[PDB]
Write an enzyme that holds these catalytic residues in place. Structure first.
Site, short mmCIF file in Angstrom:
data_model
loop_
_atom_site.label_atom_id
_atom_site.label_comp_id
_atom_site.label_asym_id
_atom_site.label_seq_id
_atom_site.Cartn_x
_atom_site.Cartn_y
_atom_site.Cartn_z
N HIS A 142 -26.29 9.84 -41.26
CA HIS A 142 -25.10 8.99 -41.31
C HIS A 142 -24.76 8.64 -42.78
O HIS A 142 -23.62 8.83 -43.22
CB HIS A 142 -25.31 7.72 -40.45
CG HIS A 142 -24.18 6.73 -40.52
ND1 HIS A 142 -23.32 6.52 -39.46
CD2 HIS A 142 -23.77 5.90 -41.51
CE1 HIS A 142 -22.43 5.60 -39.80
NE2 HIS A 142 -22.68 5.20 -41.03
N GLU A 143 -25.74 8.16 -43.53
CA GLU A 143 -25.45 7.68 -44.90
C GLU A 143 -25.06 8.86 -45.81
O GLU A 143 -24.08 8.78 -46.55
CB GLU A 143 -26.64 6.91 -45.49
CG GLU A 143 -27.08 5.64 -44.73
CD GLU A 143 -25.94 4.64 -44.46
OE1 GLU A 143 -24.89 4.72 -45.12
OE2 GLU A 143 -26.10 3.77 -43.59
N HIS A 146 -21.55 10.04 -45.44
CA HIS A 146 -20.53 9.32 -46.21
C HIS A 146 -20.27 10.04 -47.55
O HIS A 146 -19.14 10.09 -48.01
CB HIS A 146 -20.92 7.88 -46.50
CG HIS A 146 -20.67 6.97 -45.34
ND1 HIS A 146 -19.45 6.87 -44.73
CD2 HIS A 146 -21.50 6.13 -44.68
CE1 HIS A 146 -19.52 5.98 -43.75
NE2 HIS A 146 -20.75 5.52 -43.70
N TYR A 157 -12.14 3.18 -46.89
CA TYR A 157 -12.99 2.39 -46.03
C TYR A 157 -12.23 1.15 -45.56
O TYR A 157 -12.59 0.02 -45.88
CB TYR A 157 -14.29 2.03 -46.74
CG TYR A 157 -15.48 1.87 -45.83
CD1 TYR A 157 -15.86 2.88 -44.96
CD2 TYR A 157 -16.24 0.70 -45.85
CE1 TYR A 157 -16.95 2.74 -44.14
CE2 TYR A 157 -17.36 0.55 -45.02
CZ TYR A 157 -17.69 1.57 -44.17
OH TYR A 157 -18.78 1.46 -43.34
N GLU A 166 -16.40 6.09 -40.57
CA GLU A 166 -17.62 5.71 -39.84
C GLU A 166 -17.94 6.66 -38.70
O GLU A 166 -19.09 7.06 -38.53
CB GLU A 166 -17.55 4.28 -39.29
CG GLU A 166 -18.10 3.19 -40.21
CD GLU A 166 -19.47 3.51 -40.80
OE1 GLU A 166 -20.48 3.69 -40.11
OE2 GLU A 166 -19.58 3.55 -42.01
N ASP A 226 -15.09 -6.93 -40.76
CA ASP A 226 -15.66 -5.60 -40.85
C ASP A 226 -14.63 -4.59 -41.43
O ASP A 226 -14.41 -3.51 -40.89
CB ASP A 226 -16.17 -5.21 -39.46
CG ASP A 226 -16.87 -3.86 -39.44
OD1 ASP A 226 -17.61 -3.53 -40.39
OD2 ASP A 226 -16.66 -3.11 -38.46
N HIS A 231 -16.58 -0.34 -38.23
CA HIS A 231 -17.74 -0.05 -37.37
C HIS A 231 -17.49 -0.38 -35.91
O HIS A 231 -18.35 -0.14 -35.07
CB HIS A 231 -18.96 -0.88 -37.78
CG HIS A 231 -19.47 -0.57 -39.14
ND1 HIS A 231 -19.18 -1.36 -40.24
CD2 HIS A 231 -20.26 0.43 -39.59
CE1 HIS A 231 -19.77 -0.85 -41.31
NE2 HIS A 231 -20.43 0.23 -40.94
#
Ligand SMILES: [Ca+2]
Ligand SMILES: [Ca+2]
Ligand SMILES: [Ca+2]
Ligand SMILES: [Ca+2]
Ligand SMILES: [Zn+2]
EC number: 3.4.24.27
Length: 316
Positions: A142-143, A146, A157, A166, A226, A231
């Site tokens: 996931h990270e 990005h 974002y 996301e 958020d 998310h």
């Protein structure tokens, strides 16, 4: 650092034993020279000053509990590199074999992980809500995803483009987990989330609404928390990806599944060819429909399932 490539052994966060690529020069360092310009793992030492110190070990064995998060960040970064290389022909996140850097033991009791524009960073969690976050292959992928997104579409974002950003990270995080066959599922973070409680996860792609995330566009979050729900509203896209791959019936709309490989190819193509920094959900649908058309033809089942899946979540 300059030195001799070797192979060490250690134990990850969940107690499993694994081999990791190290480099020897007086000490053994968590530096894997076998992948692109290298994979480098650093100790942030419970501080917030990044990246911290390149991880050094005296005997090339990594079995201390303090070692565990570094072992998994290093190993799973390698697996994620292998996925983009072998499956999509992409060499690291920038496409030109950029060095992948991660820091672990970031801060104290820190219940998150992130890409900071230049590297990955992993907290240790507080022991109740999370254990060290590099323990989850889907979290690591996931990270890093990005980074892939920032270098390709450049999704902002914020708001819907941020929710796309996301979702792309959850989608590829999950496809990496499947690729590595590490007890795979369509849930995010289950391996490191709430160690006291079994069977839960941070987010669900198969059923977002299980944790209160929307699974249809009519249910999208429209406030300011958020970053405009990046998310939260990702649930709408996550459900669509899940439907495209696995099929199913959702709010009365039936979708025939075309499998994970094709999901991956379709979304990788949309990301790298058609998405732009300000793309919204409607444009993601168009991008993904055009990608399946490119790959499979305008009258293919693959194009039909993509349309079906977006119809099912109310994205037109
Ligand atoms: Ca050691
Ligand atoms: Ca799993
Ligand atoms: Ca998972
Ligand atoms: Ca749990
Ligand atoms: Zn993310």
């Amino acid at each position: 650092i300059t030195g001799t490539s070797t192979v060490g052994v250690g134990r990850g966060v969940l107690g499993d034993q694994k081999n990791i690529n190290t480099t020897y020069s007086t000490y053994y360092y968590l530096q894997d020279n076998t992948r692109g310009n290298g994979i480098f793992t650093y100790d942030a030492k419970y501080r917030t000053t990044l990246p911290g110190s390149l991880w050094a070990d005296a005997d090339n064995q990594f079995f201390a509990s303090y070692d565990a998060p570094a072992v998994d960040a290093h190993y799973y970064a390698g697996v994620t590199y292998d996925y983009y290389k072998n499956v999509h022909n992409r060499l690291s996140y920038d496409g030109n074999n950029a060095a992948i850097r991660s820091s672990v033991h970031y801060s104290q009791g820190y219940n998150n992980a992130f890409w900071n524009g230049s590297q990955m960073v992993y907290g240790d969690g507080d022991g109740q809500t999370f254990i060290p976050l590099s323990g989850g292959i889907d979290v690591v992928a996931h990270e890093l995803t990005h980074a892939v997104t920032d270098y390709t579409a450049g999704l902002i974002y914020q708001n819907e483009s941020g929710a796309i950003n996301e979702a792309i990270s959850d989608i590829f995080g999950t496809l990496v987990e499947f690729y590595a066959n590490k007890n795979p599922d369509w849930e995010i973070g289950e391996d490191v989330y709430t160690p006291g409680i079994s069977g839960d996860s941070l987010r669900s792609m198969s059923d977002p609404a299980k944790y209160g995330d929307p699974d249809h566009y009519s249910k999208r979050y429209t406030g300011t928390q958020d970053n405009g729900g990046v998310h939260i509203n990702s649930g709408i896209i996550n459900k669509a990806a899940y439907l495209i791959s696995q099929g199913g019936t959702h709010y009365g709309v039936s979708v025939v599944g075309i499998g994970r490989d094709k999901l991956g190819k379709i979304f990788y193509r949309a990301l790298t060819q058609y998405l732009t920094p300000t793309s919204n959900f409607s444009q993601l649908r168009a991008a993904a429909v055009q990608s399946a058309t490119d790959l499979y033809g305008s009258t293919s089942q693959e194009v039909a399932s993509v349309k079906q899946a977006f119809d099912a979540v109310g994205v037109k």
